[PDB]
């Protein structure tokens, strides 16, 4: 999400994700908690076991927010304002953790959409996830 | 790196299935496309303009193969990562002047490529072990910096 | 450079730097080449010795570009467009190196303006230098 | 870390002049102001709202002093950084879950504070040696991650 060509790639790739955005969000969270145990610290009130209902529900919320973002690529700060305050001012999430979640989401997309996850699309997605991360941490700036 | 016996065995079993030529070529190619500043170190490979030119470049495929072969050595020598990569650390620091952050980037790209190739078999638990491996290699390559 | 309060702190701090912007730019470059030897790679055509005329001249160019930036805090991408192309498309500078130069510039300011380099001002400057770095690497995004 | 004999001597000489209470309090305070996510780990210190509240907080000064004292141990044990920081690495990883990137951040803040306190005496050559020290401590604290 930045250049015209990147916006086109991101919109097209997310069309292929479609109604699976919630499921992929949940899986990406699972890959993150297992691969990067430092992240479990933000979720003391969750059951973090595999198949947990709370992770499922939260993954849906993450997927919906990403789906929102793709619809508002020309005004991410406006569309994601409530979430900036939450992550940066209330939760004080360490910015490094956004890079970790992004990697886990890219990993999850590779698993499920191997033919659609081309080098060009991977590069556009990376930029998109970095743009979202910047917005969510923008209160730190 | 410190893996359980179960973890090590699952890591090794997956490696049996890794085509170092296909995976290596794809991993290096994606690094060059997704993080374009890395192209600076590979000027002698010729045309690296667009994704099509990168992914089909014979020098990218040949070098990617060498990189994966070297990863493979690390995977079979998990107790002696520092010793296995000592010479390569020297080359990358002293001669090439590559910032160590880029070793982490290539490691993560390799994981994404493994995920693409193995699909559902590349489970959240298996990725977690590979993340350990990847970090261990990056740290071993950074040691002489 | 972002929030109103940060813009005010940055403008005020740079007023104290004043005509020394070039000298501080040169010193920051020197601290970078010595502290972080990987950076010397981008300057093979320079004499990198202490007191070198080329480092002096280049430090002046860096200081002037920062002085420009402070005058255009509401449109950094517009003001710094020529420089984005140079650093990202022609030179392919690794983004990590911007964080290193920023640290060295902050170090140099601490040396010369110890009474003016307060915690509030340090925080605003950090944000300013990060905003400049983002613009100069924006072609990567 | 690997310093020449001349470098080590200059590092040690500067440390003779370091007030661990003043420098330590200022370094931790600036970390909390400049990188506000770090405040998450220090909730028990009370009011950390604004720069004024942070810099004057007695718990921030007392903890900053402890951190600098521990840095001082590293400076006097440059050959055995890993051994000197083994216990603290365990605490920071296992108990506190601090991301290692933050050790680098605190190290750089400490250098900026040294620059502020020593002015022209903190030469480009002396900063270069301190950068080595700071990286060595960060790496030693990250070792058990
Ligand atoms: C792509 C980046 C991210 C997106 C789109 C995102 C999205 C969201 C959304 C939409 C919510 C609101 C749920 C609700 O209103 O109940 C939320 C909450 C939350 N997020 Fe994030 N998030 C991101 C990154 C992160 C990261 C990296 C962390 C930490 C590792 C994190 C930790 C949390 C926590 C602790 C909550 C509150 C959960 C609760 O108490 O129910 N988020 N996130
Ligand atoms: C997982 C991390 C990495 C591994 C395992 C690895 C491995 C290797 C190997 C095996 C060689 C061949 C050395 C020889 O001929 O003896 C090499 C060379 C080289 N590497 Fe890496 N490497 C890594 C990361 C990187 C990165 C991130 C860069 C990007 C700057 C890089 C840039 C180069 C270059 C420019 C060469 C020389 C190729 C030539 O002959 O022109 N390496 N590396
Ligand atoms: C605050 C961030 C930076 C600013 C404001 C800045 C500013 C400038 C300016 C104004 C020029 C143009 C000089 C001319 O037109 O002759 C330039 C050129 C250049 N910059 Fe940067 N720069 C920054 C960061 C960096 C970094 C981090 C590096 C690499 C470590 C770098 C490497 C170069 C090189 C190699 C040139 C060409 C020099 C020559 O051949 O004469 N710059 N920079
Ligand atoms: C240069 C790197 C660092 C050094 C040398 C250092 C040193 C120390 C020392 C000496 C202690 C006291 C341990 C004891 O009582 O036995 C401590 C505790 C602690 N550290 Fe660090 N530290 C570093 C980095 C960090 C960072 C970046 C954070 C930010 C998350 C952090 C968070 C904490 C916390 C929350 C405690 C516990 C304080 C309490 O009792 O509530 N440390 N550290």
Total number of domains in chain A: 1
Count CA within 13 A, CB hemisphere, residue D142. 16
Q: What are phi and psi of D88, to 5 degrees?
A: -65, -30
Q: Cβ distance C66 to C21 under 8 Å?
A: yes
User: Following DSSP, what letter does each residue of C46-96 receive, concatenated?
Assistant: S--STT-HHHHHHHHHHHHHHHHHHHTTT-HHHHTHHHHIIIIIIS---TH
Residue D9: HSE in the Cβ half-sphere, 13 Å Cα cutoff? 3
Helix (H, G, I), strand (E, B) or coil at C101: helix
Q: Based on C-alpha coordinates, what's the Rg of chain C?
A: 14
Residue C67 sits at the vertex; the CA angle it makes with C64 and C73, to the nearest 5 degrees, is: 140
State how far residue B120 is from chain A, nearest Cα, in angstroms.
Answer: 6
Smallest CA–CA distance from B99 into chain C, residue? C38
Nearest CA in chain B to A122: B34
Q: Ligand 2 centre and the CA of C48: distance in Å? A: 27
- Taking CA–CA distances from C123, the nearest residue in chain A reads A141
- Closest ligand to B96 CA? 2
Residues with Cβ within 8 Å of C119's Cβ and at least 6 positions away in sequence, in order, are D29, D30, D33, D34, D51, D54, D55
Asked if residue B1 lies in contact with residue B41, where contact means CB atoms within 8 angstroms, the answer is no
Tell me the domains of chain B and their CATH numbers.
Answer: 1-145 (1.10.490.10)
CATH of the domain at C11: 1.10.490.10
Interface partners of D (3+ CB pairs, < 8 Å)? A, C
- The resolution in angstroms reads 1.9
Query: Residue A76: CB partners within 8 Å, gap ≥ 6?
Result: A1, A69, A131, A132, A135
Is D143 annotated as contributing to ligand binding?
no
Atom 7 of ligand 2, nearest CA residue = B67
Which experimental technique did the depositors report for determining this structure? X-ray
Cα–Cα–Cα angle for B19, B24, B30, nearest 5°? 135
Cβ-contact A6, A128 below 8 angstroms:
yes
SS (H, E, C) chain D: CCCCHHHHHHHHHHHCCCCHHHHHHHHHHHHHHHCHHHHHHHHHHCCCCCHHHHHCCHHHHHHHHHHHHHHHHHHCCCCCHHHHCHHHHHHHHHHCCCCCHHHHHHHHHHHHHHHHHHHHHCCHHHHHHHHHHHHHHHHHHHCCC
CA distance D79 to A57: 51
Tokens of C46: 């320079």
Residue A43's SS3 state is coil
- Are A96 and D101 in contact by the 8 Å Cβ rule? The answer is yes
* Substitution site in C52, C56, C58 for ligand 3 pocket (most atoms within 8 Å of beta carbon): C58
Q: Which domain holds residue C59?
A: 1-141
D117 is in an annotated binding site: no
Q: Which residues of A112-130 are buried (b: 16+ CB within 10 A; e: fewer)?
A: bbeeebbbbbbbbbbbbbb
CA–CA distance, A51 with D118 (Å, rounded to integer): 57
C-alpha closest to that of B32 among C135, C92, A9: C92
Looking from the CA of residue D41, the nearest atom of ligand 4 is 35
Tokens standing for D89? 């690495």
The HSE-up count of residue C4 (CA atoms within 13 Å, CB side) is 0
Give the largest CA-CA distance in chain B: 45
Supply the Cα-derived Rg of chain A in whole angstroms: 14
d(CA A136, CA B136): 30
Both tokens of residue A127? 């930029």
State the number of CA atoms in the 13 A half-sphere of B116 facing the CB. 20
């Amino acid at each position: 999400v930045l250049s015209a060509a990147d916006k086109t790639n991101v919109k097209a790739a997310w069309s292929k994700v479609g109604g699976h955005a919630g499921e992929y969000g949940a899986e990406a969270l699972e890959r993150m908690f297992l691969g990067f145990p430092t992240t479990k610290t933000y979720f003391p009130h969750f059951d973090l076991s595999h198949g947990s209902a709370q992770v499922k529900a939260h993954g849906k919320k993450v997927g919906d927010a990403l789906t929102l973002a793709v619809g508002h690529l020309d005004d991410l700060p406006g569309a994601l304002s409530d979430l900036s305050n939450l992550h940066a001012h209330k939760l004080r999430v360490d910015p490094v953790n956004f890079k970790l979640l992004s990697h886990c989401l890219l990993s999850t997309l590779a698993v499920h959409l191997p033919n659609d996850f081309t080098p060009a699309v991977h590069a556009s997605l990376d930029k998109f996830l970095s743009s979202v991360s910047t917005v969510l941490t923008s209160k730190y700036r | 790196v410190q893996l359980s016996g179960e973890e090590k065995a699952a890591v090794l079993a997956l490696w049996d299935k890794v085509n170092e030529e296909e995976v290596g070529g794809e991993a290096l190619g994606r690094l060059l496309v997704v993080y374009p500043w890395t192209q600076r170190f590979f000027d002698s490979f010729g045309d690296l303009s667009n994704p099509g030119a990168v992914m089909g470049n014979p020098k990218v495929k040949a070098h990617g193969k060498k990189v994966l072969h070297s990863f493979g050595e690390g995977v079979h020598h998990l107790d002696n990562l520092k010793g296995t990569f000592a010479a390569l650390s020297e080359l990358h620091c002293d001669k090439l002047h590559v910032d160590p952050e880029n070793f982490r980037l290539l490691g993560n790209v390799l994981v994404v490529v493994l995920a693409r190739h193995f699909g559902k078999d590349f489970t959240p638990e298996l990725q977690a072990s590979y993340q350990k491996v990847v970090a261990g290699v990056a740290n071993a390559l950074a040691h002489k910096y």
